[PDB]
Amino acid sequence: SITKCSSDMNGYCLHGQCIYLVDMSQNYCRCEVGYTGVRCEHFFLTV
Amino acid sequence: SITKCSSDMNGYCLHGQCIYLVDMSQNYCRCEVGYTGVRCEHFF
Amino acid sequence: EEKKVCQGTSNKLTQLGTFEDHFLSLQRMFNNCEVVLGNLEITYVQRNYDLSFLKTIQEVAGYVLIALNTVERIPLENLQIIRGNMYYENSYALAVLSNYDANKTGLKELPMRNLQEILHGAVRFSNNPALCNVESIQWRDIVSSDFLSNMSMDFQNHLGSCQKCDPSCPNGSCWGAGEENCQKLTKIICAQQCSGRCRGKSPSDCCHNQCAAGCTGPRESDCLVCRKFRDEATCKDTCPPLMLYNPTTYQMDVNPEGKYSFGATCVKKCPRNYVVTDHGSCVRACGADSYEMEEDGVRKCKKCEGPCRKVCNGIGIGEFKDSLSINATNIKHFKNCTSISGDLHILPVAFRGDSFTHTPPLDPQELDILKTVKEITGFLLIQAWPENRTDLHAFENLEIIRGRTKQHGQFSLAVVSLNITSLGLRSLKEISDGDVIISGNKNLCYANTINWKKLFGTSGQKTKIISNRGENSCKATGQVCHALCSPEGCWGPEPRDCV
Amino acid sequence: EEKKVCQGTSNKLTQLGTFEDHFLSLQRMFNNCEVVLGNLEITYVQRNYDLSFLKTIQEVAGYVLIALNTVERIPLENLQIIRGNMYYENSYALAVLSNYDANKTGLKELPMRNLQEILHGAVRFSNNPALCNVESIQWRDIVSSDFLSNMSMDFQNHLGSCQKCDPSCPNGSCWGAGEENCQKLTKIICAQQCSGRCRGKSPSDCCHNQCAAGCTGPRESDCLVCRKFRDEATCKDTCPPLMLYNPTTYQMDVNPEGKYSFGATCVKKCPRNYVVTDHGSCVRACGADSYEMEEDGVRKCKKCEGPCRKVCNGIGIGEFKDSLSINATNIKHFKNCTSISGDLHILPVAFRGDSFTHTPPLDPQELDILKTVKEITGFLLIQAWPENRTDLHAFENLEIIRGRTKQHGQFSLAVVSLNITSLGLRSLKEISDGDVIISGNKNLCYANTINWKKLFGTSGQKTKIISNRGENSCKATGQVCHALCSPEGCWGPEPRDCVS
Numbered sequence A: 001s002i003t004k005c006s007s008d009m010n011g012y013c014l015h016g017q018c019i020y021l022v023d024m025s026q027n028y029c030r031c032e033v034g035y036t037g038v039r040c041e042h043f044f045l046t047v
Numbered sequence B: 001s002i003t004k005c006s007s008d009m010n011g012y013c014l015h016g017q018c019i020y021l022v023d024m025s026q027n028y029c030r031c032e033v034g035y036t037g038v039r040c041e042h043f044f
Numbered sequence C: 001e002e003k004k005v006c007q008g009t010s011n012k013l014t015q016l017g018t019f020e021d022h023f024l025s026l027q028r029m030f031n032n033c034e035v036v037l038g039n040l041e042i043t044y045v046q047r048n049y050d051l052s053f054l055k056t057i058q059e060v061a062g063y064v065l066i067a068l069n070t071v072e073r074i075p076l077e078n079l080q081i082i083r084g085n086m087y088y089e090n091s092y093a094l095a096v097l098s099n100y101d102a103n104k105t106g107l108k109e110l111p112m113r114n115l116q117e118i119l120h121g122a123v124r125f126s127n128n129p130a131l132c133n134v135e136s137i138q139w140r141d142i143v144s145s146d147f148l149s150n151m152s153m154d155f156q157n158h159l160g161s162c163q164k165c166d167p168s169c170p171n172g173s174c175w176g177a178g179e180e181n182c183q184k185l186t187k188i189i190c191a192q193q194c195s196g197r198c199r200g201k202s203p204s205d206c207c208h209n210q211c212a213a214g215c216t217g218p219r220e221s222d223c224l225v226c227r228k229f230r231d232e233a234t235c236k237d238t239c240p241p242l243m244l245y246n247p248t249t250y251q252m253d254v255n256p257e258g259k260y261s262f263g264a265t266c267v268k269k270c271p272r273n274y275v276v277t278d279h280g281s282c283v284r285a286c287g288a289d290s291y292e293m294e295e296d297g298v299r300k301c302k303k304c305e306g307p308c309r310k311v312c313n314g315i316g317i318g319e320f321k322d323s324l325s326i327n328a329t330n331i332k333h334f335k336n337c338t339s340i341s342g343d344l345h346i347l348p349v350a351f352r353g354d355s356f357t358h359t360p361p362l363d364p365q366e367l368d369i370l371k372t373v374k375e376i377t378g379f380l381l382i383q384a385w386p387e388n389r390t391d392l393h394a395f396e397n398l399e400i401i402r403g404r405t406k407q408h409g410q411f412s413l414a415v416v417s418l419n420i421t422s423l424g425l426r427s428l429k430e431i432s433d434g435d436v437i438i439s440g441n442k443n444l445c446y447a448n449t450i451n452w453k454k455l456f457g458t459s460g461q462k463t464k465i466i467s468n469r470g471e472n473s474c475k476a477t478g479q480v481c482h483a484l485c486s487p488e489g490c491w492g493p494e495p496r497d498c499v
Numbered sequence D: 001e002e003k004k005v006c007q008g009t010s011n012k013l014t015q016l017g018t019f020e021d022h023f024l025s026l027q028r029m030f031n032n033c034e035v036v037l038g039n040l041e042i043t044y045v046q047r048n049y050d051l052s053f054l055k056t057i058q059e060v061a062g063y064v065l066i067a068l069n070t071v072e073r074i075p076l077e078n079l080q081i082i083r084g085n086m087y088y089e090n091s092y093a094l095a096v097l098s099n100y101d102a103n104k105t106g107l108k109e110l111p112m113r114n115l116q117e118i119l120h121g122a123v124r125f126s127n128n129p130a131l132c133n134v135e136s137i138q139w140r141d142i143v144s145s146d147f148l149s150n151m152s153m154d155f156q157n158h159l160g161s162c163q164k165c166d167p168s169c170p171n172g173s174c175w176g177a178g179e180e181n182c183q184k185l186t187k188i189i190c191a192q193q194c195s196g197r198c199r200g201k202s203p204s205d206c207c208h209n210q211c212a213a214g215c216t217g218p219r220e221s222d223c224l225v226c227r228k229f230r231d232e233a234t235c236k237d238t239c240p241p242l243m244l245y246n247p248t249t250y251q252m253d254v255n256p257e258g259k260y261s262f263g264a265t266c267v268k269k270c271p272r273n274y275v276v277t278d279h280g281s282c283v284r285a286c287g288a289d290s291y292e293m294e295e296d297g298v299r300k301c302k303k304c305e306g307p308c309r310k311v312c313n314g315i316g317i318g319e320f321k322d323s324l325s326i327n328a329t330n331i332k333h334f335k336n337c338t339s340i341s342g343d344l345h346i347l348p349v350a351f352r353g354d355s356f357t358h359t360p361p362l363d364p365q366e367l368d369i370l371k372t373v374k375e376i377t378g379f380l381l382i383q384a385w386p387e388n389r390t391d392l393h394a395f396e397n398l399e400i401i402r403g404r405t406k407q408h409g410q411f412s413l414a415v416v417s418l419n420i421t422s423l424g425l426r427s428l429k430e431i432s433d434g435d436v437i438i439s440g441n442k443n444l445c446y447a448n449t450i451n452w453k454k455l456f457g458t459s460g461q462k463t464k465i466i467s468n469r470g471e472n473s474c475k476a477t478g479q480v481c482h483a484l485c486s487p488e489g490c491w492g493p494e495p496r497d498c499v500s
């Protein structure tokens, strides 16, 4: 389902790791814990 | 048909003759020529 | 192919001149009108006078008054709905009263075949001997369930002159002779499932809840008449507003396909001679505490700020709903008023008092209260004036008369039977609509010098200036326009009165 | 009382840490949520994870993205309406995509037996082998007739554990096994005389034009859900106006039922920090000639006498709709701004540069441009800052943050993860609404000397000033407020830094 992105997309995710979804055939991210957003751009802020 | 307006109706019409309507049970003012209005108070 | 509209009247049982004058007034008022914004008042029409122009009337926003007519036939054949925005006697939307001749002849026919809906108000039929064929009518179908209590009606036919209602009509009910006058039922014979009016007895016949009189079809655009507002084809509750609150932007968006309010209709642009308000209303008179202005090519009707110190209503309206003239009691309420939303009447009663209304005579000094008036929404009628005062000084700052209301629906300025020497309206720059009458002022000069074409606004505004002081007597005495004054004419002897 | 509410999520198919982290955040977002202001995204939920908390969701204002779940049952049993105020992939308000396992087995039950209306957008179903009974749904009744062309649905189940619809179900349509899962029809089954939703086949069954999913009666108070504005217990096309014109009076008359427009609600009053218009709506900014100033403690909008002072739009709206951060490209559009109409974002990507948006690296000098900013109508988010600088120098003249918009719907000031020593916000005097969070600034030292409560204007405002440099460390290194100013704290080590 999820496969390693190509290296050319190294900096796309800002706080996480690029992931490649075969069905969608588009790139997304696995965000480091604490971050969110399509590109993991935002520190998730808590109470 | 017209019946006479009352004495109480003495000063009601400004430029006309007061006539009482039985059917409407109220007072109306037949306006003198050249005048008009509720009381015949308006010039034509 | 838009419907034609008329202002309506409010004269009630006033007769305007003789039978002839009155009939002619009625005529030009309701000529070809299909929907009347105000009331429909048919009175004193005499036998042999043709009322066929009434056939074109389709709906009346206010009330319909038919009183003191001797004519045989009143052909309101296509009047569908009477809304009842106003009442005759605070309790009626339709009042037919004493349509009988002294000979006991009178109103015989009243074929209101399509009158199917009265939204508000009750009905009164009283003293109509010659009338028949109207006895056989059920109003629960026509009048609203809330008002059947007030509705009062009595029927009496002297000589049974009228014929039988055609059988095809249900329960022998019809306004006239043939099948054409059969009473159409659109409510009482409706299946329990119909929310409102229905074309027929079946459930498939029900009409959309927005329909008013009936419907040719199931959907809301099939309504014969709309109960609230008609936006082009379709009936609705309210006109779409011109702006809307975007629930996700938290800002205001312009709504294309938002429309103003004109009568019971919605339109993109206000009819000519009408103005739009900021709250969506489209209106001819700026009754609101706001005053009219042309902004961005349209009249704004904007609030009483800046030039407007204050706004006030004219005589016979609201605070002065039943006053005959500017009088000692009410004149104080014109203080600081910079705009009149209506008419101004100044009659002899004002000066000689009226005990019937507990109104003392008017102190002439108080007329100076009106020095702040600059605009009159209606007409200015001056039929009395203090003898000593030379000119209409009280209106030296009057700039405009809108002419929306015209005495008898015609005149907008009327200076009659005064002892003045000069008008003195040295601020009057515009008479938007209506004629001008100035007569009976035996000492008045200068009135014929004015170039009235420069003050008019509409096509056929004419001028009746007669029986004043002659242009030759004034020259002999030396009362003439100032030498500096020239083609413009003058409002008075003085240069300040120059034009 | 009133509807519980959650913010929603716009992550699409991005995964938030591990499957466990992801699931947790999801639950934290939608536990006891009734209305979703944004988008309802259910992704990567694994087998046997309990999703019962979704049962309380009744309406989603944005889109619903159910994707990449191996869990068997997603119980959105009370979801009544999807408004589609925002679309997934430019066309869909409901996208169910690729909910299957490597073994080919995944999402099987999706019993949205109350989903009866989708205001805007189309629908997309793809790659759900385990799914049961959804193909039997007639979406003509649910989806608007303007988006039927755009719908793209295909159901292919070979796992085939699915049951047949209860015979009671009409036209063989059902969301599940029992009769209660038979589809409710409330639009296509209506009498010719219903403009809107209907309760049944007869003409008396029509609903008020403002009902969205259906109704239990003919009035506007009987709506299952409101189509536009919720006013107390009623659905309304427009919020009742403050003043209604009077024909007899010829003058404006106040309306007791009149209310103000705020979001999808009609309220008795606007929040203090929102702009109240003359016509009676609560707004975030002034439009066209109108400019912002408060007449009597309430922000009012009044037309500029002349050409209005320049408006500087905030990152995330206007020409900066999809800008992640003030950066090298956009900063020159903030040159002499005295007020930001919106929000400000400063992220590390700004100083690195981003090839994906074609953004070169921001020269830190450029940030001095922000020293003219005295006000921010929304929020302020700082997740990066020139590493060589020791305080937020560019905001030394910032005075007000109004918090009309708020980060994650909660924070009006968020400074995190900086190598600075002091905030340095000497001129900051009011934070009208929204919470405050300073954490992760390992070297910051003075932030807890201030009394943040003085700055707050709205009830509920609270702080999270944690996990910076510890106070013991700061005191030991000589980093406490100056001696001259010893009462109310300080924004730095210097005398000027101190409060009042």
Ligand SMILES: *[C@@H]1O[C@H](CO)[C@@H](O[C@@H]2O[C@H](CO)[C@@H](O[C@@H]3O[C@H](CO)[C@@H](O)[C@H](O[C@H]4O[C@H](CO)[C@@H](O)[C@H](O)[C@@H]4O)[C@@H]3O)[C@H](O)[C@H]2NC(C)=O)[C@H](O)[C@H]1NC(C)=O
Pocket: B026, C319, C320, C321, C322, C323, C324, C325, C326, C327, C329, C330, C349, C350, C353, C354, C357, C358, C359
């Ligand atoms: C001068 O200005 C004053 C004040 O503006 C003005 O006095 C007003 O007179 C009218 C009547 O001429 C009054 O209006 C009346 O109000 C009563 C209150 O209930 C109504 O009942 C009256 O209705 C009449 O007609 C009904 C139908 O037959 C009857 O049932 C009823 O008995 C009445 O006859 C009517 O509307 C008004 O209250 C006063 N005052 C004010 C402040 O309006 C005066 O008329 C003006 N002109 C002169 C020459 O005085």
Ligand SMILES: *[C@@H]1O[C@H](CO)[C@@H](O[C@@H]2O[C@H](CO)[C@@H](O[C@@H]3O[C@H](CO)[C@@H](O)[C@H](O[C@H]4O[C@H](CO)[C@@H](O)[C@H](O)[C@@H]4O)[C@@H]3O)[C@H](O)[C@H]2NC(C)=O)[C@H](O)[C@H]1NC(C)=O
Pocket: D090, D319, D320, D322, D323, D324, D325, D326, D327, D328, D329, D330, D349, D350, D354, D356, D357, D359
């Ligand atoms: C640095 O600031 C700059 C400028 O403020 C900013 O550049 C912006 O990048 C975004 C994304 O690359 C651009 O937004 C695009 O605009 C084009 C114009 O037609 C659209 O076609 C694009 O559509 C995408 O997103 C849509 C969502 O509405 C989708 O429907 C569609 O499928 C596409 O995915 C997209 O909206 C924007 O034009 C520039 N701004 C300018 C004017 O240069 C940059 O993003 C900032 N740096 C960072 C870190 O983001």
Ligand SMILES: *[C@@H]1O[C@H](CO)[C@@H](O[C@@H]2O[C@H](CO)[C@@H](O)[C@H](O)[C@H]2NC(C)=O)[C@H](O)[C@H]1NC(C)=O
Pocket: C027, C028, C031, C032
């Ligand atoms: C009422 O309207 C009718 C029709 O518009 C008027 O009759 C027309 O009069 C104009 C000139 O005034 C002519 O051009 C037309 O030829 C007339 N109609 C027809 C059928 O030819 C009538 O004049 C109006 N009534 C009043 C009060 O003037």
Ligand SMILES: *[C@@H]1O[C@H](CO)[C@@H](O)[C@H](O)[C@H]1NC(C)=O
Pocket: C091, C146, C147, C149, C150
């Ligand atoms: C007229 O109708 C009103 C309500 O429409 C009612 O309250 C009032 O009593 C009625 N008046 C008469 C005289 O019947």
Ligand SMILES: *[C@@H]1O[C@H](CO)[C@@H](O)[C@H](O)[C@H]1NC(C)=O
Pocket: D027, D028, D031, D032
């Ligand atoms: C959800 O909220 C309820 C009620 O406030 C609380 O008891 C429960 O612990 C919460 N569940 C989770 C895991 O957030």
Ligand SMILES: *[C@@H]1O[C@H](CO)[C@@H](O)[C@H](O)[C@H]1NC(C)=O
Pocket: D364, D386, D388
């Ligand atoms: C910060 O200071 C260090 C000192 O080593 C220097 O190397 C670096 O270039 C400086 N960075 C900036 C942006 O000034």
Ligand SMILES: *[C@@H]1O[C@H](CO)[C@@H](O)[C@H](O)[C@H]1NC(C)=O
Pocket: D387, D388, D418, D419, D420
């Ligand atoms: C911040 O701190 C120092 C300043 O002493 C700076 O040189 C360094 O690059 C920064 N470190 C981090 C972790 O940001």
